[PDB]
Amino acid sequence: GAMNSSNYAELFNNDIKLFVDDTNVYRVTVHKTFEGNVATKAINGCIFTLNPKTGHLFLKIIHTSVWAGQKRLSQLAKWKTAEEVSALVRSLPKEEQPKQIIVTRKAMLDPLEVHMLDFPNIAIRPTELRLPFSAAMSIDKLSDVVMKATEPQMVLFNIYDDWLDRISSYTAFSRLTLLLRALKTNEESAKMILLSDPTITIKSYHLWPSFTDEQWITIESQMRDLILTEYGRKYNV
């Protein structure tokens, strides 16, 4: 069934599973036309497909050309997501194929199930968690590779850098979700936190800075403060 707080540790067992987030697949800027009407202009997007155990993000870049001449783009975006995820599963060796795919929004369930009919044994699951994966485009280099693409393109990389050398996948995912929740609630502040100390750099092949364990505790505390702050700035508390 659905994924919630009670069955949280299943994410880190040894059954291969993927989260799929479609919140950045279809992206637009809304603007006024010369006549004073409103129009949308699509910009490049991405499917966010993440193995939470290994950190493997199969980032599928969605070029604006895929929307050309198409109607009801928000509905097509869910089916395009499902088509790309199905194609990704088919491209993986049998022993790398997921046993479950968890979709972060319920509207993805039917499109993915229909595209995955060939894989009756892969469970397609919703979740009750409010995961912050929409903020993946607040990761500088990730936004840059998606906005530089001139054609459809796939980028496989570990969204947890080298963290698993030092911490468990449970802890890595908690850090990731905390960073992304912070970037979602106040991006400028969150990014200021991450870079304030220029002596801590980001490796050429890394998204996040090379913090020591002690510095991550500090960082992580500062991201919590931010999320509590913003929550007071929001609700006045």
């Binding site: 097509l76 089916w79 499902a82 088509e83 039917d110 499109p111 199930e113 229909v114 595209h115 009919l117 060939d118």
Partner: protein, 300 residues
């Protein structure tokens, strides 16, 4: 005009013959129903006064044999049987009529309900859904499950309706996932109509039979089948115009006939709101929409 005699009525029972129902008291001198219109299938059905659980009954066509009802005290139910001795049967029936021990099927069709509910229902197709080939009539009851229900357990006693599943390989062409799931016309017209049913008459016949089993026996899997077959048409953008007009008539008389007090359990809110208000065919079922809105506006 044809007759279904009864050997006797040893147990108190409500008997129904199509949309008609009447009460027979324990050992009341009842010897069946006469004046049954030739040319239609019919269903004779039963609900024991002492156990309203298990409504059960028999689909039959009087052109296919001489049929009677006899209570079996071992199996505890009224059983249909065929009398092969034609002289013996006419004699029995003539005596029972002479003695006026038979209730009369009304010759008062004004509200043309039975023809309209069974227009496409054929006994030969019934006998393929209900497999029991030694008999010319078909037993159905409340509890019988469908082939599709058993996929999700006794097969001999199953309703073999045509399996419809909108999220199946049969329904969805590789490469047309979104197209085929949002517009089921391929599934309806090529897979089901051309491929399995052959023509719309056989499709409507199964749809009508499923509704009747849902209504007369509360058979839940038949109700699921009736709604599926409706939804497949309503969710197809491309449907022959003659099928839509006929569907509207079929559903009109089904809604007209449904007991007002059973609408809560035999009508699926989701399918009906979808079909009347969201589907491709939302504007093509005028009669059905008007009766639904005036009779069950709560559902909508």
């Amino acid at each position: 005009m044809n007759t279904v005699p009864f050997t006797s009525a040893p147990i108190e029972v409500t008997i129904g013959i199509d949309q008609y129902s009447f009460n027979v008291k324990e050992n009341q001198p009842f010897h069946g129903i006469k004046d049954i219109p030739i040319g239609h299938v019919h269903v004779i059905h039963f609900q024991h006064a002492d156990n309203s659980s298990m409504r059960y009954g028999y689909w039959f066509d009087c052109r296919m044999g001489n049929f009677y009802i006899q209570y079996d005290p071992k199996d505890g139910l009224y059983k249909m049987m065929e009398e092969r001795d034609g002289a013996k049967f006419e004699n029995i029936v003539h005596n029972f009529k002479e003695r006026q021990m038979m209730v009369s099927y009304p010759k008062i069709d004004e509200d043309d309900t039975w023809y309209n509910l069974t227009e496409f229902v054929q006994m030969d197709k019934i006998r393929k859904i209900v497999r029991k080939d030694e008999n010319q009539f078909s037993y159905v009851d409340s509890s019988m499950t469908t082939v599709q229900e058993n996929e999700l357990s006794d097969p001999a006693h199953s309703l073999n309706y045509t399996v419809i599943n909108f999220k199946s390989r049969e329904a969805i062409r590789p490469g047309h996932e979104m197209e085929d799931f949002l517009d089921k016309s391929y599934y309806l017209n090529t897979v089901m109509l051309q491929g399995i049913f052959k023509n719309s008459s056989n499709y409507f016949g199964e749809l009508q039979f499923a509704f009747l089993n849902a209504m007369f026996f509360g058979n839940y899997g038949s109700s699921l089948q009736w709604h599926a077959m409706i939804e497949l048409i309503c969710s197809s953008a491309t449907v022959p115009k003659h099928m839509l007009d006929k569907l509207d008539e079929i559903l009109y008389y089904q809604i007209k006939t449904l007991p007002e007090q059973y609408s809560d359990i035999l009508l699926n809110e989701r399918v009906w709101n979808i079909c009347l208000y969201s589907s491709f065919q939302k504007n093509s079922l005028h009669n059905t929409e008007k009766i639904m809105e005036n009779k069950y506006p709560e559902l909508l």
